[PDB]
């Protein structure tokens, strides 16, 4: 039968997906979802996403599940950088700004936000880390302002690690900004609290 937890709330996802401001990639914003109901069919079926890729789950099976926890990580990247937000990937974002574990369960959702994020003179409030001494471990946030080297000296050199991007209406697609939300799941060995819309009985 269907015998799910006695949940009395709908999940507060509007705050995750329909926000006016998104975090920069090096300082991505994590939120936890718990003790609520969500219908994933609706979001999945919407045609607005350019990317909707799941790891370990299939979108069509999401409503039959209930999770220990759901974490939503949101941020802005360029369109050509979408490739890097995946397990197994490398590159300046995968390595210096937002690292996923390679063993990953959850869904990566993304859409074009040129209409909200690009500004006529360039939206320079969005910054990316170009310089780091080593790669990140999964789910780290490098929000430091330390300065990087060039030649073999202490601190030509002294590079500020972050670079703003010219998100401007003039950009071709690869340079348009994209909003990315990653839903990371915890499940199975647990008193799960985030459930789909099922008709619990007996």
């Amino acid at each position, epitope marked *: 039968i269907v015998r799910f937890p006695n949940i009395t709330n*709908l*999940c507060p996802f*509007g*705050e995750v*997906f329909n*926000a*006016t401001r998104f975090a920069s990639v090096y300082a991505w914003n994590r939120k936890r979802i718990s003790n609520c109901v969500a*219908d994933y069919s*609706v979001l999945y079926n919407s045609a607005s996403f350019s990317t909707f890729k799941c790891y370990g789950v299939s979108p069509t099976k999401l409503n039959d599940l209930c999770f220990t926890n759901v974490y939503a990580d949101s941020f802005v990247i360029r369109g050509d950088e979408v490739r890097q937000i995946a397990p197994g990937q490398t590159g300046k974002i995968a390595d210096y700004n937002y690292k996923l574990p390679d063993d990953f369960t959850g869904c990566v959702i993304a859409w074009n936000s040129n209409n909200l994020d690009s500004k006529v003179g360039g939206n320079y409030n969005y910054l990316y880390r170009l310089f780091r001494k080593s790669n990140l471990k999964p789910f780290e946030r490098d929000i430091s302002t330390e300065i990087y080297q060039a030649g073999s000296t202490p601190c030509f050199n002294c590079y500020f690690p972050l670079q703003s991007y010219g998100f401007q209406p003039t950009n071709g697609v690869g340079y348009q900004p994209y909003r990315v939300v990653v839903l990371s799941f915890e499940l199975l060995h647990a008193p799960a609290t985030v459930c789909g*819309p099922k008709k619990s009985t007996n």
Partner: antibody
Amino acid sequence: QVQLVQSGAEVKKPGSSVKVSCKASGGTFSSSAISWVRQAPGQGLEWMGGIIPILDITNYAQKFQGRVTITADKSTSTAFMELSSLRSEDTAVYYCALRNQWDLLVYWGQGTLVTVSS
Amino acid sequence: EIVLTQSPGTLSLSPGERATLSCRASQSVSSSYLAWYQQKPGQAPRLLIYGASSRATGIPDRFSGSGSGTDFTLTISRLEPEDFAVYYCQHYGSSLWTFGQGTKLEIK
């Protein structure tokens, strides 16, 4: 694509009852909450209560506990509010409003005046 | 409970100038649940701002919302002749909605 559609009304005597329907369209009836809001002539807006059809949870504003029943029927994507034992202080415009999860935007219907008089 | 209070109750403004409306909550709220609306006599409320800042579709960029905690505001950059209306703030969290009286923005 969400739209809320409401019916018209008239009541001929206090003590009677009005039941107002709100038809939702645009899909996503499920995973949304439906609220009822009243606007008496010369006044601002007040919330009466609301329902979440898939949890089947109804929450009433305290001043309206008693007289007010809020229900829903998802099979026809609609919702209802009924106010019994009318006292003519309530000859207000009644609005339905909806909000979906996965969003922040609030959709409103066309409020309907319920006039109660001899 | 969550009580919104608006100020000033009334305004007297020139068409063409800038003006703002203040909304103050009794207790702090998430900005994600604040909205601003306007009415013309005989009309249903028109949504202007949602999530305390996003502009609703069809609303001209004269209207700009902002705020946090208990203190929120709506700014109208020019007060065009069509902008003279009753305005109000709403908190729309899931457990209880509250509407803030309203302010009348008059021309004179």
